[PDB]
Design a protein around this ligand. Structure first.
Ligand SMILES: CCCC(=O)N1CCC[C@H]1C(=O)NCc1ccc(C(=N)N)cc1
Ligand code: NA
Ligand code: NA
Lengths: 27, 10, 250
């Protein structure tokens, strides 16, 4: 249900330092 | 070895 | 992990450490997929060429960890195995085809800021995300180079590689139940999994629902971070039918 949503990141709407590198490759 | 031993209970 | 970096606290709360009871040491990585199921590589548990054949009572799962060596009081949780399930068609004799195992915990683990399950891919997420050039992320406490060990969990982001480049980089027979990832020599950047990272997850963050999915399991590689070589991962979606059956029957 809750899988894949990290308490200290997605659940707080905080991004980790390099997740955007992944997003930018999903082109 | 480099590992801190764990609680005996485990 | 070679050429990776230190993880942030709680960056990979599904990361699991497979731990040998005596002599007490890291055996492999793994991942939490629900409050009682842990996913890993079969070769972490069964590999006859190396006289490896572990049973439930030889091992513990450590969840919520950051430090490799330290006992992280009030943060990690340590769990006992009820039962190991190895894919019945895992090919340890030839190429590690279907390199996947499930471990059922004796009791459910409590979720926290540092402990939380990753998603497993549906067919549509896998189709959308498993494309050459798309990056995923690998985590682990394994070696920092091919020929020491890190103080804390390491992370590296790596691009999926096209199947013909995967195949032409090796003499091993590659199957549809595997994919490979890593940079080309041409690409500059580098990084890889290594010994000790086995069984840990290759994850991708879906841009459709902003959830992390485990697309691969660290399976094998020839050396670590060699130019022209790539790391190979078990293709989780291709084996999901087996995963569901195990979980649905047990
Ligand atoms: C097939 C080449 C040797 C190999 O990788 N095997 C022999 C049977 C077990 C598996 C293994 O060592 N997995 C550990 C490993 C090694 C390298 C990587 C990598 N460079 N990405 C990942 C995992
Ligand atoms: Na080849
Ligand atoms: Na390489």
């Amino acid at each position: 249900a809750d899988c894949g949503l990290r308490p200290l990141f997605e659940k707080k709407s905080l991004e980790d330092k390099t997740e955007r590198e992944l997003l930018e490759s999903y082109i | 070895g480099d590992f801190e031993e764990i609680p005996e209970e485990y | 992990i070679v050429e990776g970096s230190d993880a942030e606290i709680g960056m990979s709360p599904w990361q699991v450490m497979l731990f040998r009871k005596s002599p007490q040491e890291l055996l492999c990585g793994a991942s939490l997929i629900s409050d009682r199921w842990v996913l890993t590589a079969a070769h972490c548990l069964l590999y006859p060429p190396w006289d490896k054949n572990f049973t439930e009572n030889d091992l513990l799962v450590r969840i919520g960890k950051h430090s490799r060596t330290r006992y992280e009081r009030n943060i990690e949780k340590i769990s006992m195995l009820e039962k190991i399930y190895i894919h019945p068609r895992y090919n340890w004799r030839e190429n590690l085809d279907r390199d996947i195992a499930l471990m059922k915990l004796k009791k459910p683990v409590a979720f926290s800021d540092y402990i939380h399950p990753v998603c497993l891919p549906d067919r549509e997420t896998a189709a959308s995300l498993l494309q050459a050039g798309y990056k995923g992320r690998v985590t682990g406490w394994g070696n920092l180079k091919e020929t020491g060990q890190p103080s804390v969990l390491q992370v590296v982001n790596l691009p999926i590689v096209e199947r013909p480049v995967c195949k032409d980089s090796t003499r091993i027979r590659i199957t549809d139940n595997m994919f490979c990832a890593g940079y080309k020599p041409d690409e500059g950047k580098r990084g890889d999994a290594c010994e000790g990272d086995s069984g840990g997850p290759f994850v991708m963050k879906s841009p459709f629902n902003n959830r992390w999915y485990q697309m691969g399991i660290v399976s094998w590689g020839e050396g670590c971070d060699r130019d022209g070589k790539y790391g190979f991962y078990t293709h989780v979606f291709r084996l999901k039918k087996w995963i569901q059956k195990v979980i649905d029957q047990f």
